[PDB]
């Protein structure tokens, strides 16, 4: 009858990190959805994490759960980790605290000191315990974020740490709308992902589950889409918030109204 | 620029309480909104609480914030405590972990062992430090909840503790729709609230701010409506979620759709 949960940011240095976060002085209130407040991480902050994930920016599901990467992008990432034998021993952090409000106008402010400095503080903290043995960045901006981190004083000691830059999980659906082109690019992604998994498997010497590598096909299998674990969510959040069915979307008659609203809908089958 | 927050349930005995909570085996899944998961509390759990508030059941605002009494009822309660000099030294718990559906019935189940046993555990925990000097129940069901606690072995030792049953803060708008009856019923409530404050002022000997009691008039004044404090909310939640303007409602084309959906709308003025 036991249900696990994440108990948040009560221990240092995370406690101070979450009380002194940057707002409109670092993140432009127009090009960033700072109106929803910062979503900080996902995963273990007790030091048991073995792989670090660097994502890009949060979406609307994350805006409700208050943990990053809990949508479709997250479930694809869970399956990627599962292939390495990693089931719970991970920590994820985003390139941006807030969501980009574009227009994909994310790279417009990638050089803001107030933004990079604060992210580096989170990198310094999660890497501090020295237990991370692999780092994976999602997309090109996370890639630039990690590489800019290794060029800083505090991060210079991680140039040797196993690292793979892979394509952002939502690239196929972001690059085209036709199911045909989307399916073709997915095959291209899964092929590139297979190359990264082969390079990381020998570096991950402490998996939650010993696992022989099984590569992706041309398309995703349902088993390669893994639900977020209960242990990642705050206390009390229902099981369907970490299920396979979408439940949050932005809704508005125009752009101004759509930005101001998130609609939450419980999947069918929960309520008798 | 420091923003405080509640870091949840990482310390015992609360950690185990939030990992082993009751579901459909104690709360009937039709007469209770268990689909949204449990909302546990609001306030201090470090032992600095001086006043215990016992509420009834959570609403749609609480379902997003994941703390109880953050809606209009909560803001009226804040102002009630503010008159006793209490600004942050409090802890609040609901009679039910979930929000009844309806209802109609709403009290069919007030005596279910699976419900009361678990609530008593939360009572025992918050009261353990022996720092609570006054208890206030909201509504008739919260009143019976406290009385059921005093009839238990572990709770018999609190029959001596100063206690006041006041009317549930959202009763006037619950009793009638015409603004005339609402204003009339409010006057009756504020009269009963003033009666409770007269009885509790000498019992609250450890206020965060020494304050001379100012009784209510015939209607609520803007100053007697106090916004929930940042320290009560999880890390990252934006300031407007603890503002004076409603931003959450259940909405649907029929009863079934309304139960499955919550609408979140950012107040005007937040986004530039
Ligand atoms: O937290 C997130 N990080 C991401 O990189 C991303 N992409 C889509 N959705 C996302 N959520
Ligand atoms: O947490 C809550 N407890 C209550 O008793 C209540 N009444 C209205 N809204 C409420 N929220």
XYZ file of C-alpha atoms and ligand atoms in Angstrom:
566
model
C 0.000 0.000 0.000
C 3.157 2.134 -0.053
C 3.521 4.932 -2.617
C 6.889 6.648 -3.069
C 7.281 10.386 -3.587
C 9.890 13.120 -3.938
C 10.127 15.307 -0.850
C 11.576 18.254 -2.701
C 14.227 20.749 -1.766
C 14.563 20.697 2.009
C 18.256 19.823 2.132
C 21.066 22.218 1.184
C 22.393 23.509 -1.168
C 19.074 23.079 -2.986
C 17.093 24.840 -0.264
C 18.979 28.093 -0.855
C 18.918 27.565 -4.620
C 15.112 27.441 -4.674
C 14.697 30.536 -2.487
C 17.021 32.737 -4.532
C 16.134 32.015 -8.157
C 16.237 34.481 -11.061
C 13.117 36.219 -12.356
C 12.473 38.995 -14.851
C 15.978 40.389 -14.281
C 17.506 37.418 -16.122
C 14.579 35.889 -18.038
C 12.773 38.351 -20.332
C 9.074 38.402 -19.351
C 8.034 38.312 -23.018
C 10.338 35.667 -24.485
C 9.962 33.420 -21.421
C 6.884 32.077 -19.639
C 8.063 33.385 -16.270
C 4.412 33.839 -15.286
C 4.190 30.180 -14.270
C 7.224 30.271 -11.973
C 10.361 28.082 -12.082
C 10.341 24.297 -12.437
C 13.648 23.116 -11.028
C 14.447 19.452 -11.688
C 13.441 15.862 -11.785
C 15.119 12.998 -10.025
C 17.358 12.161 -7.147
C 19.065 14.893 -5.225
C 20.309 12.678 -2.411
C 23.392 11.718 -4.436
C 22.318 8.319 -5.762
C 21.968 9.633 -9.327
C 24.284 7.967 -11.849
C 23.364 9.836 -15.029
C 22.620 13.535 -15.499
C 20.065 14.663 -18.088
C 20.237 18.186 -19.486
C 16.934 19.173 -21.116
C 15.868 22.420 -22.792
C 12.736 24.013 -21.303
C 9.507 22.915 -19.533
C 5.985 22.635 -21.003
C 2.443 22.689 -19.569
C 2.490 19.261 -17.907
C 5.592 20.327 -16.006
C 3.759 23.517 -15.059
C 1.275 21.442 -13.048
C 3.492 18.633 -11.742
C 6.269 21.083 -10.780
C 8.906 18.640 -11.996
C 10.549 18.879 -15.443
C 10.125 16.443 -18.362
C 6.921 14.619 -17.331
C 5.231 14.817 -20.729
C 5.842 12.826 -23.906
C 9.433 14.058 -24.062
C 9.922 12.677 -20.562
C 8.458 9.246 -21.274
C 10.779 8.862 -24.261
C 13.717 9.835 -22.051
C 12.677 7.309 -19.391
C 12.834 4.566 -22.005
C 16.252 5.747 -23.142
C 17.525 5.436 -19.582
C 15.818 2.069 -19.132
C 17.986 0.720 -21.950
C 21.035 1.609 -19.853
C 19.563 -0.182 -16.841
C 18.726 3.130 -15.160
C 15.265 3.021 -13.569
C 15.450 5.646 -10.798
C 19.095 6.676 -10.400
C 19.087 9.855 -12.460
C 18.796 13.612 -12.122
C 17.429 15.984 -14.749
C 17.890 19.732 -15.123
C 16.715 22.134 -17.823
C 18.693 24.649 -19.865
C 16.043 27.188 -18.866
C 14.111 27.501 -15.615
C 11.058 28.729 -17.464
C 9.511 27.742 -20.767
C 10.453 29.568 -23.935
C 7.682 31.740 -25.310
C 8.273 31.633 -28.994
C 8.657 31.509 -31.819
C 11.232 29.134 -30.315
C 12.983 32.313 -29.188
C 15.212 30.382 -26.806
C 18.656 30.961 -28.287
C 17.870 34.682 -28.182
C 18.884 34.891 -24.518
C 21.280 31.959 -24.180
C 24.066 34.392 -23.280
C 22.330 36.147 -20.390
C 24.714 35.961 -17.400
C 21.859 35.696 -14.905
C 20.662 32.566 -16.696
C 23.875 30.629 -17.294
C 25.300 31.444 -13.863
C 22.236 30.065 -12.072
C 22.173 26.868 -14.126
C 25.866 26.287 -13.428
C 25.061 26.487 -9.718
C 22.611 23.620 -10.188
C 25.208 21.689 -12.186
C 27.789 22.270 -9.461
C 25.317 20.983 -6.873
C 24.085 17.798 -8.596
C 27.611 16.843 -9.684
C 29.165 17.647 -6.302
C 28.758 14.193 -4.709
C 30.939 12.825 -7.528
C 28.630 9.877 -8.217
C 27.588 10.828 -11.761
C 29.189 8.594 -14.397
C 27.327 9.759 -17.542
C 25.759 12.973 -18.886
C 23.146 13.234 -21.651
C 22.004 16.524 -23.184
C 18.705 16.850 -25.054
C 18.827 19.113 -28.093
C 21.401 21.643 -29.207
C 20.954 24.259 -26.486
C 21.472 21.765 -23.668
C 24.560 20.676 -25.575
C 25.890 24.237 -25.623
C 24.986 24.570 -21.955
C 27.056 21.572 -20.903
C 29.969 22.614 -23.095
C 29.894 26.139 -21.677
C 29.871 24.544 -18.214
C 33.022 22.523 -18.875
C 34.730 25.786 -19.837
C 34.017 27.318 -16.425
C 36.268 26.876 -13.393
C 33.870 24.701 -11.404
C 33.058 22.508 -14.408
C 36.566 22.018 -15.791
C 36.847 18.886 -13.646
C 34.206 17.123 -15.755
C 35.760 17.226 -19.229
C 36.546 13.526 -18.793
C 33.048 12.561 -17.682
C 31.228 10.424 -20.246
C 29.036 12.665 -22.368
C 26.651 12.253 -25.295
C 24.643 14.901 -27.120
C 21.515 13.323 -28.608
C 18.628 14.765 -30.613
C 15.782 16.347 -28.639
C 13.006 13.735 -28.082
C 10.308 15.933 -29.690
C 12.264 16.638 -32.887
C 10.173 14.462 -35.221
C 6.874 16.108 -34.253
C 8.563 19.523 -34.220
C 10.129 19.264 -37.677
C 7.010 18.362 -39.672
C 3.258 17.695 -39.448
C 2.775 14.968 -42.066
C 2.844 11.520 -40.453
C 5.169 10.362 -43.230
C 7.986 12.874 -42.699
C 7.554 12.571 -38.931
C 8.012 8.808 -39.159
C 11.093 9.153 -41.367
C 12.886 11.559 -39.029
C 11.996 9.361 -36.062
C 13.934 6.562 -37.758
C 16.847 8.971 -38.132
C 16.675 9.870 -34.440
C 16.423 6.332 -33.100
C 19.429 5.456 -35.258
C 21.474 8.264 -33.710
C 20.234 7.321 -30.246
C 21.510 3.783 -30.788
C 24.991 5.180 -31.389
C 24.875 7.101 -28.102
C 23.602 4.128 -26.104
C 26.517 2.025 -27.348
C 28.994 4.671 -26.193
C 27.391 5.047 -22.755
C 26.718 1.418 -21.829
C 30.303 0.682 -20.727
C 30.520 3.936 -18.734
C 27.398 3.220 -16.674
C 28.957 0.738 -14.275
C 26.281 1.115 -11.577
C 22.866 0.540 -13.183
C 19.741 0.086 -11.069
C 19.264 -3.037 -13.185
C 22.028 -4.889 -15.053
C 20.941 -4.789 -18.701
C 22.226 -6.007 -22.060
C 21.638 -3.296 -24.656
C 18.624 -3.623 -26.984
C 18.592 -1.061 -29.827
C 15.584 0.896 -31.070
C 13.807 -0.097 -34.265
C 12.669 2.378 -36.907
C 9.842 3.521 -34.635
C 9.060 3.654 -30.918
C 7.709 0.549 -29.231
C 5.209 1.010 -26.367
C 7.710 -0.638 -24.014
C 10.296 1.986 -24.950
C 7.884 4.631 -23.654
C 8.156 4.400 -19.883
C 5.922 6.195 -17.399
C 7.538 8.534 -14.892
C 8.024 6.817 -11.541
C 6.007 7.748 -8.451
C 9.231 8.587 -6.636
C 9.692 11.580 -8.990
C 6.412 13.323 -8.112
C 5.492 15.420 -5.049
C 3.435 13.814 -2.284
C -0.176 13.150 -3.212
C -0.149 13.611 -6.986
C -2.442 10.987 -8.558
C -1.127 8.099 -10.647
C -2.596 9.402 -13.907
C -0.422 12.528 -13.742
C 2.424 10.122 -14.487
C 0.525 7.933 -16.941
C 0.690 7.419 -20.694
C -2.275 9.675 -21.522
C -1.984 13.481 -21.964
C -3.997 15.597 -19.512
C -2.866 19.218 -19.915
C -3.067 21.739 -22.749
C -3.053 25.515 -23.201
C -6.356 26.980 -24.365
C -7.324 30.393 -25.693
C -9.122 32.189 -28.511
C -5.952 34.088 -29.426
C -2.282 34.199 -28.405
C -2.805 36.441 -25.368
C -5.542 34.218 -23.943
C -3.779 30.958 -24.770
C -0.742 32.063 -22.759
C -2.855 32.744 -19.678
C -4.600 29.377 -19.438
C -3.841 25.711 -18.868
C -6.677 23.207 -18.972
C -6.354 20.008 -16.911
C -8.431 16.978 -17.916
C -8.333 13.661 -16.056
C -7.920 10.754 -18.507
C -10.955 8.555 -19.133
C -11.146 5.521 -16.844
C -9.926 7.087 -13.602
C -13.335 8.016 -12.197
C -15.743 5.046 -12.008
C 14.692 39.150 -3.161
C 14.525 36.069 -0.927
C 11.338 34.055 -1.415
C 10.469 31.514 1.258
C 8.703 28.222 0.640
C 7.452 25.062 2.310
C 9.714 22.114 1.563
C 7.041 19.587 2.328
C 7.159 16.248 4.006
C 10.777 15.129 4.172
C 10.977 14.781 7.951
C 9.258 12.051 9.974
C 6.581 11.134 10.974
C 5.104 13.056 8.053
C 7.269 11.274 5.484
C 5.690 7.895 6.255
C 2.241 9.470 6.534
C 2.396 10.807 2.982
C 3.661 7.485 1.625
C 0.923 5.380 3.207
C -2.324 7.311 2.778
C -5.817 5.835 2.314
C -7.526 5.516 -1.069
C -10.756 3.951 -2.292
C -10.720 1.467 0.601
C -11.573 4.261 3.051
C -12.901 7.078 0.848
C -15.778 6.020 -1.405
C -14.592 6.942 -4.917
C -17.985 8.405 -5.912
C -18.759 10.482 -2.819
C -15.155 11.736 -2.638
C -12.993 13.309 -5.348
C -10.152 10.827 -4.873
C -9.254 11.222 -8.550
C -7.176 14.306 -7.716
C -5.148 12.643 -4.978
C -4.781 13.757 -1.338
C -3.981 17.271 -0.132
C -2.367 16.952 3.276
C -1.940 20.302 5.059
C -0.967 23.966 5.202
C 1.432 25.508 7.681
C 4.299 24.721 9.944
C 5.433 21.229 10.640
C 8.645 22.076 12.481
C 6.865 22.515 15.813
C 6.539 26.297 15.672
C 2.786 26.070 15.100
C 0.765 27.656 17.912
C -2.718 27.229 16.462
C -4.290 24.209 14.804
C -6.980 24.802 12.190
C -9.299 21.938 11.299
C -10.976 22.556 7.942
C -13.552 20.494 6.061
C -12.470 19.482 2.553
C -10.278 20.892 -0.258
C -11.447 22.647 -3.445
C -10.002 23.261 -6.923
C -7.432 25.874 -5.854
C -6.010 23.445 -3.301
C -5.830 20.760 -5.998
C -3.246 22.798 -7.912
C -1.251 24.316 -5.053
C -1.327 21.009 -3.137
C -1.874 22.807 0.161
C -5.249 23.152 1.882
C -7.219 26.375 2.405
C -5.606 28.527 -0.285
C -8.897 29.727 -1.762
C -11.351 32.356 -0.534
C -11.995 30.316 2.609
C -8.263 30.294 3.272
C -7.868 34.051 2.878
C -10.714 34.686 5.320
C -9.048 32.290 7.744
C -5.707 34.102 7.396
C -7.382 37.339 8.456
C -8.976 35.564 11.397
C -5.556 34.447 12.619
C -4.076 37.855 11.828
C -6.354 39.325 14.505
C -4.756 37.032 17.091
C -1.282 38.180 16.063
C -0.722 34.933 14.171
C 1.051 35.597 10.880
C 2.901 32.332 10.249
C 2.753 30.214 13.412
C -0.074 27.847 12.478
C -0.836 24.431 11.013
C -3.987 23.466 9.123
C -5.529 20.062 8.446
C -8.757 19.079 6.704
C -11.443 16.738 7.997
C -11.121 14.857 4.701
C -8.070 14.336 2.553
C -10.163 14.692 -0.491
C -12.997 16.898 -1.592
C -16.460 15.347 -1.348
C -18.355 15.117 -4.540
C -21.533 17.073 -4.252
C -22.958 16.671 -1.814
C -25.277 15.095 -1.295
C -24.301 13.343 0.731
C -21.038 14.736 2.054
C -21.266 13.200 5.519
C -22.330 9.652 4.753
C -18.896 8.601 5.739
C -17.746 10.831 8.545
C -17.272 7.890 10.840
C -15.478 5.478 8.569
C -12.485 3.994 10.464
C -10.213 4.215 7.426
C -10.814 7.965 7.397
C -10.735 8.902 11.090
C -7.814 6.650 12.043
C -5.624 8.313 9.429
C -6.744 11.809 10.420
C -6.037 11.069 14.082
C -2.474 10.216 13.089
C -2.081 13.702 11.641
C -3.602 15.192 14.790
C -1.237 13.238 17.028
C 1.739 14.319 14.935
C 1.075 18.065 14.831
C 0.135 18.097 18.523
C 3.065 15.964 19.693
C 5.536 18.805 20.307
C 3.030 20.249 22.783
C 3.337 23.698 21.204
C -0.281 24.146 20.069
C -2.238 26.400 22.453
C -5.526 26.791 20.553
C -7.612 24.750 18.113
C -10.215 26.150 15.718
C -12.584 23.970 13.687
C -14.288 25.202 10.520
C -17.838 23.933 10.081
C -19.826 21.218 11.800
C -17.928 18.258 10.355
C -14.581 19.648 11.465
C -16.134 20.125 14.895
C -17.168 16.472 15.091
C -13.715 15.482 13.851
C -12.000 17.163 16.794
C -14.517 15.615 19.170
C -13.856 12.157 17.740
C -10.155 12.748 18.366
C -10.769 13.618 22.021
C -12.660 10.331 22.462
C -9.622 8.307 21.408
C -6.946 7.101 23.816
C -4.168 9.241 22.357
C -6.413 12.291 22.083
C -8.051 12.180 25.511
C -5.117 14.278 26.714
C -6.370 17.291 24.738
C -9.813 17.725 26.296
C -8.236 20.588 28.262
C -6.869 22.399 25.200
C -8.569 25.694 24.315
C -10.987 25.006 21.474
C -13.471 26.925 19.330
C -15.906 25.775 16.680
C -16.612 28.627 14.274
C -18.757 28.686 11.141
C -17.128 27.478 7.935
C -15.731 30.614 6.194
C -17.594 29.990 2.914
C -20.996 29.336 4.512
C -22.792 32.595 3.542
C -22.213 32.073 -0.184
C -23.081 28.413 0.373
C -26.450 29.174 1.969
C -27.928 31.538 -0.639
C -27.283 33.258 -3.981
C -28.917 36.660 -3.479
C -26.405 39.253 -2.314
C -28.936 40.393 0.276
C -29.161 37.086 2.144
C -25.406 36.682 1.696
C -24.747 39.993 3.436
C -27.219 39.085 6.170
C -25.710 35.654 6.787
C -22.229 37.169 6.761
C -23.236 39.504 9.576
C -24.330 36.474 11.597
C -21.024 34.717 10.902
C -18.823 37.680 11.798
C -20.769 37.937 15.045
C -19.971 34.316 15.864
C -16.369 34.785 14.759
C -16.024 37.765 17.094
C -17.353 35.576 19.904
C -14.634 33.008 19.260
C -11.881 35.629 19.064
C -12.902 36.956 22.470
C -12.489 33.458 23.897
C -9.178 32.731 22.147
C -7.272 36.007 22.515
C -6.165 35.225 26.077
C -5.224 31.663 25.064
C -2.946 32.739 22.214
C -0.002 33.809 24.359
C 2.670 33.383 21.670
C 1.731 35.568 18.691
C 4.236 36.357 15.939
C 3.116 39.951 16.435
C 1.616 41.314 19.651
C -1.742 42.659 18.499
C -4.743 44.220 20.198
C -7.956 42.481 19.174
C -10.072 44.321 16.601
C -13.511 42.735 16.196
C -15.252 42.403 12.824
C -17.909 44.804 11.591
C -21.034 43.733 9.711
C -19.023 42.807 6.611
C -15.491 41.741 5.695
C -13.014 44.582 5.251
C -10.221 44.296 2.648
C -7.623 44.222 5.439
C -9.353 41.253 7.069
C -8.686 39.324 3.871
C -5.036 38.283 4.005
C -3.140 36.607 1.167
C -1.523 33.247 1.894
C 2.189 33.652 2.628
C 5.005 32.433 0.374
C 6.400 30.153 3.071
C 3.192 28.089 2.887
C 3.570 27.248 -0.810
C 5.827 24.676 -2.544
C 9.034 25.771 -4.260
C 8.528 27.711 -7.471
C 4.814 28.537 -7.334
C 4.282 32.085 -8.647
C 3.003 34.892 -6.424
C -0.409 35.165 -8.106
C -1.281 31.659 -6.893
C -1.317 33.235 -3.433
C -3.017 36.458 -4.510
C -6.496 37.883 -3.951
C -7.965 36.976 -7.346
C -9.487 33.555 -8.109
C -7.737 31.619 -10.877
C -9.114 28.062 -10.736
C -12.552 26.583 -11.484
C -14.132 23.262 -12.456
C -15.734 23.506 -15.906
C -17.577 21.015 -18.133
C -20.510 20.539 -20.504
C -22.130 18.012 -18.166
C -21.599 16.636 -14.659
C -19.167 13.963 -15.842
C -17.020 16.415 -17.801
C -17.036 19.003 -15.021
C -15.684 16.458 -12.554
C -12.828 15.562 -14.885
C -11.623 19.105 -15.580
C -9.991 22.084 -13.874
C -9.387 25.466 -15.523
C -6.374 27.555 -14.493
C -6.358 31.213 -15.549
C -3.583 33.661 -14.729
C -5.019 36.933 -13.369
C -4.764 40.004 -15.595
C -1.650 42.124 -15.089
C 0.856 39.351 -14.423
C 1.972 39.030 -18.032
C 3.239 42.369 -19.406
O 11.077 19.823 -19.058
C 11.107 19.719 -20.303
N 12.299 19.802 -20.924
C 12.410 19.699 -22.254
O 13.524 19.778 -22.817
C 11.171 19.489 -23.037
N 10.859 19.341 -24.338
C 9.513 19.179 -24.429
N 8.946 19.221 -23.195
C 9.910 19.410 -22.287
N 9.945 19.529 -20.956
O -8.817 23.218 2.059
C -9.995 23.623 2.164
N -10.674 23.328 3.289
C -11.938 23.728 3.474
O -12.556 23.446 4.523
C -12.580 24.513 2.395
N -13.784 25.081 2.193
C -13.764 25.679 0.973
N -12.554 25.504 0.379
C -11.773 24.792 1.200
N -10.519 24.332 1.147
